[PDB]
Design a protein around this ligand. Structure first.
Ligand SMILES: CCCCCCCCCCC[C@H](O)CC(=O)SCCNC(=O)CCNC(=O)[C@H](O)C(C)(C)COP(=O)(O)O
Ligand code: SF4
Ligand code: SF4
Ligand code: FES
Ligand SMILES: [Zn+2]
Lengths: 198, 116, 231, 687, 114, 83, 27, 83
């Protein structure tokens, strides 16, 4: 019941984290190998295209594929959204996480140039959280309804939205309607008050 | 670059919240109080921003509780008064901050109950 | 959640024993036909570097000849103890991608064969009651188990704060969950990487200089199911 | 700087000498798993579930009773202090009956959690469990005591907060049973707290037996309106009806405890409740009708009647926001006779100086007093969580309590000076013995319960007390800060009324009867149709149909404090805000709006139209209503005395007697209580 | 305090964009009514456009007006194209929704919620 | 028209209130005597210049700010209202 | 080893509130 | 009327539901079926009640049939046990 882990990795990757931090001192704010044996290089938002280009095209760190781009929203932090890019190196069989912070009104650059995989993921981050990607070809709603107002995955958006749809005979169209739910969603306050010893 | 602005970041026009749920609605920043039923103090450490309580009525057919308040199950959790007031002002809601109520220190001694 | 019923492994042997004939029966029907090869061969060719850049990560990656499975590169579970051959491709096109999918069905029968031959006696869920529920008899006879059943079902595991991106080779391609977790019993974020969000993006590049009918083949060879893409 | 330095797993905190090992961990932030240790209850050491290991020490120590010494590093997450918890939890659980899906302290268990976090994954107890015999401790506490972990919290609370030493341990060995040897019910106020304080679900609440389960309950923090201590409380609502009211901690007002009345009278809140606006119809029967029709019944009469022909007898649980909306309405019309049912002597400065009518010493000041001369009240049953204050300060500190009232059960040792108001003059003269006792007091306080003021010589009783306070102050040479004189109320909407400028007593309405009266939640008998002009047009504004409803030409249903964001203020002036736990029922509406709307139909529209605006209005009438949780000190007493000296009145020889002589008196005292089935069951149990 | 510009530096500069969108929308309303076989009149719709462009007419943080344009333009793209069907566009007219009264007496008279 | 009450809202500890406080300590005891039966609800200000409100016949009120107004001035200001 | 018997739901709840019944005879 | 009331008042409009229909109501009330059961006599002071089963019944709780005055009732089965 304790994961079978290899310490070789923690060390090897930790060493790469120092390598990346040395090669790019201007944009990397903190590098840490977590105990899950994964690496995370946290970069200033301005370093989004530099840091990812170095990883996509460096002989000692080829990170060809963009696994995903997602944005955790911690409402407390001033810069709420924390865009996170997970990248994979087929050559060295290892994976890296580059995460940067973006606020509601401050856009971050688009890596579509570095990886064309991001063309869609960046559109989803805009639709879901409202982060805007600079000089991004065709940014527009990927997942939400054509007329949807509001960014849904933001922690400040109600689970069930504000509008619902129904067919109204009188107008013969699918009309929206302020949300009335027949059974509110019981929100369970299930969270123990005795903290676990770390 | 570095333009200067002189106002709160009013993102109320970017949020997408129907006016009536951004106008007539009061958030109540507060650090939740302890469940007297238990003595764990781990649920009274982070500041929450919950909204006003509107109508919770009964579905005529099955007797369930129904509601029209989209922002009813909303309990944003912050880490300081400062960061909660900021979010509410950011989104255009009205706030009612309530200061924290940590128990003061009460001196306890075993022997004391043996005096006469 | 529960142990295998007493007759499942015999029945899986009987299915796997005869399934191989069913594959090549489809094999003779579609592999050599003039009509299928013309409809599939040299349609939606994707070059190797373009496949990595577009984040294809699946049979779409292997069909173009790139060597990557995620079951032999970054092994999960006990795949490190089962032997199989990745069926990589050479022309990175519909047919080569079809042929790869037919081979993986065959290679999976080889892996299913090993699992039935070498499945260990043991229990099916970790024995820590603080993560996997307690057994039905134990919760009804010992208090520590009732408390652990009540808390686990009502509240939860309360996983320690952290975040992880774990990718396994789902049949479509790399399926990964970026689970960000506060110390709470309920998650904070769960980004489902869908092999399919990347593949459908490739449709415009892959289906270029192609007629209406080719597009029907292009979507078919990405094995895209919209639940994963839409999430 | 007598701080002594001690290490919490290294954080090296510095603490006052005499802080327990458990307390040292708290300031670093660590929590010792604990049972049988409650902050405001004596340390007992019964469970020993808190064993920790101070450094390079031979054995584990009890964090609840060990005074931390110099430079002992506590190791709270060592390999030892976990075997000291993995092995205790083995024992508590071994004799425990597995009926967690019966134990309604399901998610509210401090014993499953600690098992589920610090205890053991399995069981080794392959033997036979024990069982005890369920007994009846009352109609409020369901003691399924086979659950008891013999943690002796109950025994202590029963003996240190409530002074009722009826509970106790009986028998030794595993046979120890914590209960009342003979079956005598645990009848006392403060009784229901045992539920909240027993971490096990052995004894829990009988009304809230099986109606809910805690994860579901949505918890809204509000204020107590049943009594004037204004105790903080949390109303637990599920799917829109209140399921339980349990205490939430306010250091100064209710420190984790609430009264038996304000916890079991949430049931009274759900029946006999007004909902639709009926209007007398036909032969006189009241007939449900739409607001528009009921409001213009009232508005038309209001336009017809001039000032002093329209009067309001408010009283009981009405909020400050309605009280200013009713004054602003009747004053647009000439009538300025807004009044309250509880008569506070106005024969003198009256309400003009706030200090006159507010416990000046705060509830929390009772802890620092040196002698308290309670005159005229049974604090126990009027303001129980203030009786507790004098309970704690007579035990942990040394308050000398003296009562000039009926000799009455006070849960502490008081000195019964006598049952005569005039002996107040005896102390003022220095004739009575306790005159020196006070002379010896450096910080004395005097308490006069409104329940006395309500007699006919109440003006004289206040004046007589003010003379003695003045004398006391002079002799005691008490600092200006200490405010010897304070008076406690027993009606939630009194202080606010008095502050907003409402004149107490229905004496003014008595001398000139009003053509139209808008009773505002008044269920008192202060005036009756029998005592009104023949027209007798009267419109009840309230939540429960009790006394004012059947004698009402119009019924305008309102809400209750569980159902509105109103403000209340307790005796020490501390304004507090009730939050809406449940939307008001039926067509019933918030009290302030009914009156804003009636004004619009009438045409003398009130200025505010949203509640923030009414809060702004309150700021204009009395500015310490817009300010919450703050007690303000400006003791404009000296001038109060000067006017008291001008007032000449006779204190009649009749002894001053509190109306709540014994606890059956206490249970049912208000609309929301007199309608309580739980309170009714309690009343018959006593009788 | 200092803030990076999203696309425009001064509110005035940005308004240049706000007008370059108004025009676009105005010149499009006519097209939509016809293309999406909507029933509302050109004039009626063009009214809505002003209303909206007007609703947002109080913010002064360029970055916000730099952002609402974008969102604004995106809504044109969809509408210019027929990515949006009749249902979508007609939703800007609360056809079925009964406009909520505002008068206090009009609300007190219905619904316990403000 | 006819004064019905006068509410003197005075901060508790500030230069502005200073003096207003004096009025109370020097004349309230007498004012109340002189024109009793006149609610002079003295109440507390907060972070705001002291003020004296006064209801009249039909819902009418007047304000007079007395921030930093000296004692004698207040005295008269009260006398002016109860002319 | 059209039908009339159609399930129809309830609110099996005991009505959870009680309104004051006005006084039967006038005053 | 269901074992838990629910009977609609004649005036209740909530009765249309059952028109051309009927009402799903269980005829086997557990308040009575459990009363139609023999009090389980026992010899021991305390007794178990696995719910007549091991892992197919209800959690196992020990009941104190110590007072003939009261037949212990397992909170799960409602079975009275006669000392
Ligand atoms: C059915 C067919 C028509 C469809 C109906 C809606 C179609 C229009 C669609 O909503 C697009 C839109 O409204 S997007 C415009 C949003 N709003 C802005 O982009 C900024 C405007 N406001 C400001 O820039 C400032 O507040 C300021 C006061 C400085 C300018 O104000 P002003 O220019 O001086 O008036
Ligand atoms: S107390 Fe009630 S809930 Fe807590 S464990 Fe014992 S039974 Fe289960
Ligand atoms: S009853 Fe509750 S409190 Fe009293 S001892 Fe048993 S457990 Fe401890
Ligand atoms: S908690 Fe320390 S003795 Fe029980
Ligand atoms: Zn049973």
């Amino acid at each position: 019941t304790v994961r079978p882990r290899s310490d070789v990795t923690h060390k090897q990757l930790s060493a790469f984290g120092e390598y990346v931090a040395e090669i790019l001192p201007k944009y990397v704010q903190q590098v840490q190998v977590s105990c899950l044996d994964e690496l995370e290089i946290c970069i200033h938002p301005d370093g989004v295209i530099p840091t990812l280009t170095f990883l996509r095209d460096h002989t000692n760190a080829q990170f060809k594929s963009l696994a995903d781009l997602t944005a955790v929203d911690v409402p407390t932090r001033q810069n709420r959204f924390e865009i996170v890019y997970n990248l994979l190196s087929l050559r060295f069989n290892s994976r890296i996480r580059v995460k940067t912070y973006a606020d509601e009104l401050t856009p971050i650059d688009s890596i579509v140039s570095v990886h064309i995989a991001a063309n869609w993921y960046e559109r989803e981050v805009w639709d879901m959280f409202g982060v805007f990607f600079f000089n991004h070809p065709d940014l527009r709603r990927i997942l939400t309804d054509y007329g949807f107002e509001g960014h849904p995955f933001r922690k400040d958006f109600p689970l069930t939205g504000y509008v619902e749809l129904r067919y109204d005979d009188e107008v013969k169209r699918v009309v929206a309607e302020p949300v009335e739910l027949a059974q509110e969603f019981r929100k369970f306050d299930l969270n123990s008050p005795w903290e676990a010893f770390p | 670059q570095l333009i200067t602005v002189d106002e709160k970041l009013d993102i109320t026009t970017l949020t997408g919240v129907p006016e009536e749920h951004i106008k007539t609605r009061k958030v109540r920043i507060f650090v939740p109080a302890r469940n007297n039923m238990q003595s764990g103090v781990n649920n009274t450490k982070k500041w929450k921003m919950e909204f006003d309580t509107r109508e919770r009525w009964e579905n005529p057919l099955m007797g369930w509780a129904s509601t029209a308040d989209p922002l009813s199950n909303m309990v944003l959790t912050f880490s300081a008064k400062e960061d909660a007031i900021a979010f509410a002002e950011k989104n255009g809601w009205s706030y009612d901050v309530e200061e924290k109520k940590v128990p003061k220190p009460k001196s306890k001694s075993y022997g004391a109950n043996f005096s006469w | 959640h529960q142990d295998l019923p007493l007759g499942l492994l015999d029945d899986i042997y009987e299915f796997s024993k005869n399934f191989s004939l069913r594959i090549d029966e489809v094999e003779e029907m579609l592999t050599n036909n003039r009509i299928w090869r013309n409809r599939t061969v040299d349609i939606g060719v994707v070059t190797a570097e373009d496949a990595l850049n577009y984040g294809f990560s699946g049979v779409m990656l292997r069909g173009s000849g790139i060597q990557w499975d995620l079951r032999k590169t970054q092994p999960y579970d006990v795949y490190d103890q089962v032997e199989f051959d990745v069926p990589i491709g050479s022309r990175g096109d519909c047919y080569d991608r079809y042929l790869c999918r037919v081979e993986e069905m065959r290679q999976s029968l080889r892996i299913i064969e090993q699992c039935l031959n070498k499945m260990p006696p043991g229990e099916i869920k970790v024995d820590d009651a603080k993560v996997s529920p307690p057994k039905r008899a134990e919760m009804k006879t010992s208090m520590e188990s009732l408390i652990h059943h009540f808390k686990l079902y009502t509240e939860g595991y309360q996983v320690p704060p952290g975040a992880t991106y774990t990718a396994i080779e789902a049949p479509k391609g790399e399926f990964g969950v970026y689970l960000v977790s506060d110390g709470s019993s309920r998650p904070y974020r769960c980004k489902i990487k869908a092999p399919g969000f990347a593949h459908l993006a490739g449709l415009d590049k892959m289906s270029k200089g192609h007629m209406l009918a080719d597009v029907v083949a292009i979507i078919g060879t990405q094995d895209i199911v919209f639940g994963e893409i839409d999430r | 700087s007598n701080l002594i330095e001690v290490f919490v797993d290294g954080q090296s905190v510095m603490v006052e000498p005499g802080t327990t090992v458990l307390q040292a961990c708290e300031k670093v932030g660590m929590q010792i798993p604990r049972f049988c240790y409650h902050e405001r209850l004596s340390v007992a050491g019964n469970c020993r579930m808190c064993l920790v290991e101070i450094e390079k020490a031979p054995k584990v120590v009890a964090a609840c009773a060990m005074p931390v010494m110099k430079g002992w590093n506590i190791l709270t997450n060592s390999e030892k202090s976990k075997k000291a918890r993995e092995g205790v939890m083995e024992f508590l659980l071994a004799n425990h009956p597995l009926d967690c899906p019966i134990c309604d302290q399901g998610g509210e268990c401090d014993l499953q959690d600690q098992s589920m976090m610090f205890g053991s994954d399995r069981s080794r107890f392959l033997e036979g469990k024990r069982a005890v015999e369920d007994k009846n401790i009352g109609p409020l506490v369901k003691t399924i005591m086979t659950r008891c972990i013999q943690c002796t919290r109950c025994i202590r609370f029963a003996s240190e907060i409530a002074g009722v030493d009826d509970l106790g341990t009986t028998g030794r060995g595993n046979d120890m049973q914590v209960g009342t040897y003979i079956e005598k019910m645990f009848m006392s106020e403060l009784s229901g707290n045992v539920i909240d304080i027993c971490p096990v679900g052995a004894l829990t609440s009988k009304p809230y037996a099986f109606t809910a389960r805690p994860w579901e309950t949505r918890k809204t923090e509000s204020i107590d309106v049943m009594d004037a201590v204004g105790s903080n409380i949390v109303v637990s609502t599920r799917t829109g009806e209140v399921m339980r009211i349990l205490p939430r901690m306010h250091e100064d007002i209710n420190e984790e405890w609430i009264s038996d009345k304000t916890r079991f009278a949430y049931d009274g809140l759900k029946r006999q409740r007004l909902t639709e606006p009926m209007v007398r119809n036909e032969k006189g029967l009241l007939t449900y009708t739409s607001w528009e029709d009921a409001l213009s019944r009232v508005a038309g009469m209001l336009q017809n009647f001039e000032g002093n022909a329209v009067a309001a007898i408010a009283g009981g649980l009405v909020d400050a926001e309605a009280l200013v909306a009713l004054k602003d309405l009747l004053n647009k019309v000439d009538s300025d006779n807004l009044c309250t049912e509880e008569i506070f002597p106005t024969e003198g400065a009256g309400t003009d100086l706030r200090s006159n009518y507010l416990l000046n010493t705060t509830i929390a000041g009772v802890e620092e007093a040196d002698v308290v001369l309670l005159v005229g009240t049974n604090p126990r049953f009027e303001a129980p969580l203030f009786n507790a204050r004098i309970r704690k300060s007579w035990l942990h500190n040394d308050l000398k309590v003296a009562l000039i009232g009926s000799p009455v059960d006070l849960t502490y040792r008081y000195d019964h000076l006598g049952d005569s108001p005039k002996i107040l003059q005896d102390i003022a003269s220095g004739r009575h013995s306790f005159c020196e006792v006070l002379k010896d007091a450096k910080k004395p306080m005097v308490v006069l319960g409104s329940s006395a003021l309500q007699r006919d010589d109440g003006a004289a009783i206040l004046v007589a007390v003010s003379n003695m306070v003045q004398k006391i102050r002079v002799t005691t040479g008490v600092a200006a800060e200490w405010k010897v004189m304070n008076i406690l109320h027993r009606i939630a909407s009194q202080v606010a009324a008095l502050d907003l400028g409402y004149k107490p007593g229905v004496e003014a309405i008595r001398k000139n009867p009003p053509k139209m009266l808008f009773l505002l939640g008044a269920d008192g008998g202060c005036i009756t149709r029998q005592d009104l002009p023949k027209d007798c047009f009267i419109v009840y504004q309230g939540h429960h149909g009790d006394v004012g409803a059947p004698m009402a030409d119009v019924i305008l249903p309102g809400a209750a404090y569980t159902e509105k964001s109103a403000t209340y203020v307790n005796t020490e002036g501390r304004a507090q805000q009730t939050k809406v736990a449940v939307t008001p029922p039926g067509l019933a509406r918030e009290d302030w709006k009914i009156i804003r709307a009636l004004s619009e139909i009438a045409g003398i529209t009130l200025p505010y139209d949203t509640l923030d605006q009414v809060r702004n209005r309150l700021e204009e009438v009395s500015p310490n209503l817009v300010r919450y949780d703050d007690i303000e000190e400006t003791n404009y007493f000296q001038q109060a005395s000067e006017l008291a000296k001008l007032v000449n009145q006779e204190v009649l020889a009749d002894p001053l007697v509190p109306p709540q002589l014994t606890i059956k008196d206490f249970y049912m005292t208000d609309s929301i209580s007199r309608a309580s089935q739980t309170m009714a069951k309690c009343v018959k149990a006593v009788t | 305090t200092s803030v990076k510009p999203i696309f425009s530096r001064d509110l005035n500069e940005a308004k240049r964009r706000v007008r370059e969108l108004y025009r676009a929308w105005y010149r499009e309303v006519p097209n939509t009514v016809h293309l999406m076989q909507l029933d509302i009149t050109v004039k009626q719709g063009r009214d809505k456009v002003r209303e909206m462009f007007m609703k947002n007419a109080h913010v002064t943080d360029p970055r916000v007006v730099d952002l609402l344009v974008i969102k604004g333009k995106m809504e044109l793209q969809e509408t210019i194209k027929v990515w949006k069907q009749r249902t979508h566009v007609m939703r800007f007219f609360h056809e079925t929704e009964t406009p909520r009264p505002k008068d206090f007496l009009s609300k007190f008279y219905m619904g316990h919620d403000p | 028209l006819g004064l019905r009450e006068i509410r003197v809202h005075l901060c508790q500890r500030s230069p502005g209130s200073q003096g207003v406080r004096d009025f109370i300590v020097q004349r309230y005891v007498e004012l109340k005597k002189a024109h009793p039966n006149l609610p002079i609800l003295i109440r507390e200000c907060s972070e705001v210049q002291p003020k004296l409100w006064a209801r009249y016949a039909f819902g009418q009120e007047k304000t007079v700010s007395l921030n930093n107004l000296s004692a004698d001035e207040v005295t008269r200001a009260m006398q002016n209202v109860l002319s | 080893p059209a039908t009339p018997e159609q399930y129809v739901p309830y609110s099996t709840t005991r009505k959870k509130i009680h309104e004051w019944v006005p006084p039967s005879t006038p005053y | 009327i269901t074992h838990t009331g629910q009977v609609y008042d004649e005036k209740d409009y909530r009765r249309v539901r059952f028109v051309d229909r009927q009402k799903e109501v269980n005829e086997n009330f557990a308040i009575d079926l459990i009363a139609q059961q023999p009090v389980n006599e026992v010899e021991h002071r305390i007794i178990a009640c696995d719910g007549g089963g091991g892992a197919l019944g209800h959690p196992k709780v020990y009941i104190n049939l110590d007072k003939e005055t009261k037949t212990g009732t397992c909170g799960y089965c409602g079975l009275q046990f006669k000392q």
